Structure 1
Amino acid sequence: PSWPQILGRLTDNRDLARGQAAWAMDQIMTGNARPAQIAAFAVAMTMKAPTADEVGELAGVMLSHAHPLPADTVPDDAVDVVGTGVNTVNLSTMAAIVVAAAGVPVVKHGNRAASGGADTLEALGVRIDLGPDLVARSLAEVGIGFCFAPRFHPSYRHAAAVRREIGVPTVFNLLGPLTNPARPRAGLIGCAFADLAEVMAGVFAARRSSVLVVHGDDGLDELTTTTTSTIWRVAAGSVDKLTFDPAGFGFARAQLDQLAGGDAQANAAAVRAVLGGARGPVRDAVVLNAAGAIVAHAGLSSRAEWLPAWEEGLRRASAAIDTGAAEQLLARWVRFGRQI
């Protein structure tokens, strides 16, 4: 195997042979790929259009170089809440907090902005750069933790530099959600693009995860309140693609602009406001996505069906805000950081 062969096959617009994406990612993670090869590969795979099998090899190779959390310290039922990345408020970060406040372990995964989720969390007082043991204590003691991507994926630094140098979105942009070092088996995963969402869903299905890959039919990388969303429901090795409509649960149609963010600070303030009871479109979307994650989580253990699960989901997410549990959980998480 070699770059000219792998690159050639991609520009000839052919799917790779089994193991070629893996070999390419390995070269990249070991510092043996030149930046030009890295770039050529990311672009060529983006424009050929990666298959689920190919993306699975990239993510699995990436994980095999990651720092793990200490074994037997992430619950069997932890969930991730995360988009692939419209200058909006950090709906995922808020949802994550709400999900944790409703009783469900959450472990998120991220970096400082490409206000990114990580920046907002820092702007809220949360310590984002913790090692595996403290991330694990965060889970046990607060019910949520955050894995800072560069501490857990140090070998990804060559690819990271190339991604900044070229700017453009590529296949690499899919790996965040698939390389959460805590390896939760459940999640709600937001995707800007419908074609790539199906691929993403294929990768999760081969992991036997219980996940909802979500794409707003307005292009939002979360469940939206402005229109329908497409959900790829993933469980027990298979995919149930469907059209989801939140009007069915009584959510008013909102405007895309009503969900708009700003600096880390603006987004921190939006979080403090929603968690403190402010009604509105932002809350509506936060609750919608929190319920989504709660439903995914239910996929791991419960036999419960789609609609009843969505209903429990919504009531739990609502109640976690209204009872102050979310606001209280955030304060507890902050405390935890300061008590080293």
Structure 2
Amino acid sequence: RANIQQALNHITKNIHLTQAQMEDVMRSIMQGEATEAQIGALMMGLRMKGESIDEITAAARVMRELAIKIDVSDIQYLVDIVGTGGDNLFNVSTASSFVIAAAGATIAKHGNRSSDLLEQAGINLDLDMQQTERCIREMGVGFLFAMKYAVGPRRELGIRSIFNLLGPLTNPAGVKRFVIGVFSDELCRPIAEVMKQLGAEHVMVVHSKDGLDEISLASQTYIAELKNGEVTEWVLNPEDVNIPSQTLSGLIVEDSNASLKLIKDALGRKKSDIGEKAANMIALNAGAGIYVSGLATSYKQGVALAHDIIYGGQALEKMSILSEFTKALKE
């Protein structure tokens, strides 16, 4: 109790916690030793101070230990595409996952139980870890879904918090290459530095000017990139990779069925006008994944390859093939 109260005191004085201190705190929360009021206070306080690199890294190490894991790190072109949650677009990252797989890379996608969409798409998620790893290894795409004590405070507060940050940072499959979306420009560099410390090889950390935790079709996107042990920052426009920047109109959906309908349009051979808009936003994001997986040697090249897959229809077939596979696994 004293440790948490002490942590809260420092935070009000804008004093960052040490790795040691954050580790103890996150352990307590995970072990159920922190009160709901204390969890709410920690989330709010850390968010307003700004979570430091050490705070986030220490929290991530604690959560990773307490996760059921697999290890598919032997696979070449292994990548995860994952966001904190931003500021109701269709499921771009899930759509991108199939493009990435169809391109010849492998995605082990860490998700938050998207889940409804896959189910709508005839993809059985009632799968254990062993069955998920089979999807990853044999189909080039699997979906990883899962602490307990944070779920209530998170829904009640409704804010973006360190627990959002920790989602991307706790892939349980041994993935080392990532496209990570975050909910502010100032979190891009820090999260890249965290991923470095957790052993990552290549990551793009992104946040668009229009407030998305992904690369936007409508605005510029701020990038922090970890590559070859170093972190750089740069800015992206769709035009930089021969894609026109368009408004997000028609890309906001009401429910899971509308999202799947738009995605199948966007990934199919005969695209509508809004389908072509969706296809282009997917190309920008799937492109980042193809690039950081190592399969393409630049972002531009990755986007090109993505574009080829999206307009050729192969990603839509990868969807269908995964559906048949999962249904086969369940029998």
Taking structure 2 as the reference length, the TM-score comes to 0.92
Q: Deviations over 1:184-206 (max 9, x none)?
A: 11111112211122221111122
Equivalence for 1:215: 207
SS at match of 2:235: strand
Matches within 5 A, 1:44-83: 44-69=45-70, 71=71, 75=75, 77-83=77-83
Aligned equivalents of 1:248, 1:10: Cα separation in 2: 41
Matches within 5 A, 1:86-235: 86-112=87-113, 117-149=114-146, 156-206=147-197, 207-235=199-227
Please tell me whether the aligned partners of residues 76 and 185 of structure 1 are also in contact (alpha carbons under 8 angstroms). no
* Aligned residue type for 1:223: I
Equivalence for 1:290: 286
Please tell me whether the aligned partners of residues 197 and 213 of structure 1 are also in contact (alpha carbons under 8 angstroms). yes
* Aligned residue type for 1:54: E
Equivalence for 1:268: 260
Q: Deviations over 1:83-124 (max 9, x none)?
A: 211511111111111101101000111123xxxx22211121
* Structure 2 residue 233 is the aligned partner of structure 1 residue 241: yes
Equivalence for 1:36: 37
Aligned equivalents of 1:29, 1:236: Cα separation in 2: 34
* Structure 2 residue 330 is the aligned partner of structure 1 residue 336: no
Equivalence for 2:13: 12
Please tell me whether the aligned partners of residues 181 and 207 of structure 2 are also in contact (alpha carbons under 8 angstroms). yes
Equivalence for 1:152: none
Please tell me whether the aligned partners of residues 126 and 337 of structure 1 are also in contact (alpha carbons under 8 angstroms). yes
- Structure 1: segments with no counterpart, 5+ residues: 150-155
Please tell me whether the aligned partners of residues 35 and 162 of structure 1 are also in contact (alpha carbons under 8 angstroms). yes
Identity %: 33
Please tell me whether the aligned partners of residues 275 and 327 of structure 1 are also in contact (alpha carbons under 8 angstroms). yes
Please tell me whether the aligned partners of residues 205 and 236 of structure 1 are also in contact (alpha carbons under 8 angstroms). no
Runs of 4+ displaced beyond 3 Å = 71-74
**By how many angstroms is 1:76 displaced?**
5.1
Matches within 5 A, 1:296-307: 296-298=292-294, 304=297
Aligned equivalents of 1:8, 1:336: Cα separation in 2: 53
Aligned equivalents of 1:31, 1:285: Cα separation in 2: 41
Aligned equivalents of 2:300, 2:63: Cα separation in 1: 37
* Aligned residue type for 1:168: I
Taking structure 1 as the reference length, the TM-score comes to 0.90
Aligned positions, number: 322
Equivalence for 1:153: none
- Structure 2: segments with no counterpart, 5+ residues: none
